[PDB]
Specification:
Structural class of chain A: alpha+beta
Strand content of chain A: 25-35%
Subcellular location (chain A): Cytoplasm
Largest sheet of chain A: 4 strands, antiparallel
Largest interface: A-B, 26 and 27 residues
GO cellular component, one term (chain A): cytoplasm
CATH class of chain A: Alpha Beta
Strand order of the largest sheet of chain A: 1-4-3-2
Number of helices of chain A: 3
Shape of chain A: elongated
Order of helices and strands of chain A: EHEEEHH
Subunit structure (chain A): Homotetramer, a dimer of dimers. One homotetramer interacts with 1 SecA dimer.
Number of domains of chain A: 1
Helix content of chain A: 25-40%
CATH superfamily of chain A: SecB-like
Protein name (chain A): Protein-export protein SecB
Radius of gyration of chain A: 18 Å
Main location (chain A): cytoplasm
Oligomer: homotetramer
Chain lengths: 143, 149, 142, 135
């Protein structure tokens, strides 16, 4: 029988620069979000995996092209996973686990950004399943 | 009369790093705390000053000496200050204001280390008039050097 | 192509009470935690619902029975939901959303228990799909 | 002798009973401040100073409440050796002012969770209040 369980959820790395600060608040609010996302998976112990969801957000206010902020995040989870065939295992490490972390990472980004008094940045969903399919293509590609 | 009013408390830079997860979680919680603190100031308007409070902490474990986490914060706020003798002004800026900012950067610190799922880290109350004092204590030598140019 | 988008994560209500302070800090920390959680939906706009996640936590200390803290949080959202079959939709409403809201409500609880200077309280993952299934075992009960 | 031993919240509330049917309007705020202080001896030269703050923002013209925040920020202070009245000043002006900035980011923090516009409470003349006390 297969097993997928979370052992711990924790941040491995956080960041939130907002340079041209004191002033930028004068300019008018017209964003240019520069999302990006990734996931790495390190095996730790027998049947234990660290799935890390890497995320970079970067509002940019069009005309000026001057950064409004750059939030980066590494939300991780250690999981116990066993009894899965190669492809399933890959859906776990690539969509299942990342998908469960995602919402914690969303809250983080939302919390930081909020600390810079900026306007709410509640990250929109990601389709991890697609990401899985894409993951599979990339692997056959390389092979 | 004299005027002090908060315009906007806000963050300008925050980072947090916990380089030894998860393996470190298995070690005995023997915390060693590094904690440097500092303040800066900048006028950005007519009676508009933006004070910055920097904080850096770093925990290591007694036994292995490994690093548990590093967190750096730059809490800032912009204020409207006016009608003060140069001496008052300096207190306001090196103490009064940074003081106002302290809880904000404190919470952020507690917040982040808790996301590392490490034991609480609630910075102890800081004496801000102290910094003012160090500020004064530095003048004489600084003015001397300033004069030497 | 369906539609799921977030319009506003926000708190409708939150309460934190620590009634036996500072005396309680003299007791040994032997916690017995009570946890309760529920959900509510409400169409507000046209393809716009305010999903609410209610969480209530209480902790007493075992030797004295005294209350260390009680905390209640109403974390809400307002989302744009469209183009979903009756099943997918009620799932989205009763599970998928409340889930997105979980981290927000969680952080709030840990944040407040920490201002009371009590040991950390980081709510463990909640299984909303399970609560979703029971939601159905209640409707069908009719 | 005067030193802070522990800083903590005894009670906190924050209700915004008109969401999300207001995020659509603009700001026409009418803050409703109120503030108390209570001290209690809890031990040998140990006093619990409690700073009570209420802030009921009512959006004027509409009349409805935008939110009601009620914080009890407190602290346990070791305090000894003070002439009768000069003590009062400690327990009613000195200590509270020490707690206020914590009571401030708390109120900010909540308000910011209600998505409303940043509410960074304004400075309170704690000595001036002390006067209207002895009366």
């Amino acid at each position: 029988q297969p097993v997928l369980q979370i052992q711990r959820i924790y941040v491995k790395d956080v960041s939130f620069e907002a340079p041209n600060l004191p002033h930028i608040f004068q300019q008018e609010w017209k964003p240019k979000l520069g999302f990006d996302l990734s996931t790495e998976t390190t095996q730790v112990g027998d049947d234990l995996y660290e799935v890390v969801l890497n995320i970079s957000v970067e509002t940019t206010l069009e005309d000026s092209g001057d950064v409004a902020f750059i939030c980066e995040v590494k939300q991780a989870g250690v999981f116990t996973i066993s009894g899965l065939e190669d492809v399933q295992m890959a859906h776990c490490l690539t969509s299942q686990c990342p998908n469960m972390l995602f919402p914690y990472a969303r809250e983080l980004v939302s919390n930081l950004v909020n600390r810079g008094t900026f306007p709410a940045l509640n990250l929109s969903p990601v389709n991890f399943d697609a990401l899985f399919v894409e993951y599979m293509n990339r692997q056959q590609a390389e092979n």
